[PDB]
Write a protein that binds this ligand. Structure first.
Ligand code: ZN
Length: 392
């Protein structure tokens, strides 16, 4: 009925990152490029995320790990989370800082979560979310709109000391709209102006270009490259504050940092296994999948399929075909074939070198990525990651 947040923090994996402090001029080194082309098609950054269901941003980013000193120095009573979705990042934060209250905002588009479903699952009550965006319109929940920032203080009368943004914007102009509006607020708003200029915005950014200037009076303090970000892209987290503007992180600097982590570092597994979560992810991937996943359980799911496939097409009206239902068995077979491959495969360390091995030792790789959808593949990697951790 009542849980302690500190005990839940063992279900969250250790985070590996790289901080790139924004200094004056340059190193004048003309440093070499590090490249490694991993032959991977699957989202392997979900390998250590088996203990989470709706959102798993907390497995990738953490405030204690990245901006711990700033958290101690500023000592915020309230944290503002924008573009939060199911709120797993906010959930990890609630476990690391058990006395902090939250103001949550997420776009009310009804395509993605606009309620903290993961936070509720991890924390239990939602009592610490003093403002959950309830009763707000689609534009007052959209960080690219002035009205969102105008109603941010409707419950909390604490200044925007630290704002966390994990929104995926359409384009960089939409990101700039958010950053400009944040600046406009922290310099207009009575509450925030009273605190001063020591106000921060820690936002997700995709380093596309080079030498792109931040808006006027918006200075980047540091850039964080996370091990948990999709290898393929150029995603990073940038800590911004008020001050003489500088440049956004460049695609080149990000790639080297991103590459070093992939080549050098292993993914840390969670200290404890949340068996209810793993069960939910297993059932979400394949309906009726039980833990532990072994030869017996995989053959039991194959038995359940072989007896299910032999069903005579009898109903009232021909609306849902058995030939159409054979596509659901096709997906199920694809899943079992992969999990069987994982089970038969040797134990290794959680790294992209071993992941490339797992993928290039599997014959129906292209049939897998063609048959399973993006969310299904993410679920498949959560389950795979559990299987690999369970080994030896
Ligand atoms: Zn304000």
């Amino acid at each position: 009925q009542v849980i302690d947040p500190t005990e839940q923090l063992a279900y969250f994996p250790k985070i590996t990152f790289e901080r790139l402090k924004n200094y004056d001029t340059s190193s004048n080194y003309a440093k070499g490029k590090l490249t490694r082309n991993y032959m991977i098609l699957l989202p392997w950054q979900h390998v250590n995320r088996y203990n989470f269901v709706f959102s798993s941003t907390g497995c990738k980013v953490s405030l204690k790990t990245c901006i711990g000193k700033l958290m101690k120095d500023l000592n915020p009573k309230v944290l503002y989370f924008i573009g939060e979705g199911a709120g797993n990042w906010m959930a990890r934060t609630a476990c690391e800082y058990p006395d902090i209250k939250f103001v949550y905002r997420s776009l009310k588009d009804d395509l993605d979560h606009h309620y903290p479903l993961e936070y509720q699952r991890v924390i239990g009550e939602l009592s610490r979310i003093i403002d959950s965006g309830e009763g707000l319109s689609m534009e007052t929940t959209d960080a690219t709109q002035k009205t969102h920032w105008d109603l941010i203080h409707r419950v909390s009368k604490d200044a925007l000391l630290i704002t966390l943004c994990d929104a995926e914007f359409k384009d960089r102009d939409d990101f700039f709209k958010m950053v400009i509006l944040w600046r406009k607020h922290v310099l207009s708003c009575r509450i925030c102006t009273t605190y001063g200029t020591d106000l921060y915005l820690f936002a997700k950014y995709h380093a596309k270009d080079c030498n792109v200037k931040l808006p006027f009076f918006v200075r980047s303090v540091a850039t964080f490259i996370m091990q948990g970000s999709k290898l393929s892209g150029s995603e990073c987290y940038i800590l911004l504050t008020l001050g003489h503007h500088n440049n956004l992180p460049c695609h080149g600097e990000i790639q080297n940092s991103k590459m070093k982590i992939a080549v050098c570092n292993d993914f840390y597994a969670a200290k404890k296994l949340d068996n209810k979560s793993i069960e939910a992810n297993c059932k979400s991937l394949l309906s009726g999948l039980r833990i532990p996943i072994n030869k017996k359980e995989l053959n039991r799911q194959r038995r359940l399929l072989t007896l299910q496939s032999n069903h005579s097409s009898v109903a009232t009206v021909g609306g849902s075909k058995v030939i159409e239902s054979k596509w659901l068995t096709n997906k199920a077979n694809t899943i079992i074939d992969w999990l069987e491959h994982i089970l038969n495969s040797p134990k290794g360390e959680l790294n992209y070198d071993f992941f490339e091995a797992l993928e290039n030792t599997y014959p129906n790789m292209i049939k897998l990525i063609d048959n399973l959808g993006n969310a299904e593949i993410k679920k498949l990697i959560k389950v795979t990651g559990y299987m690999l951790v369970s080994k030896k």
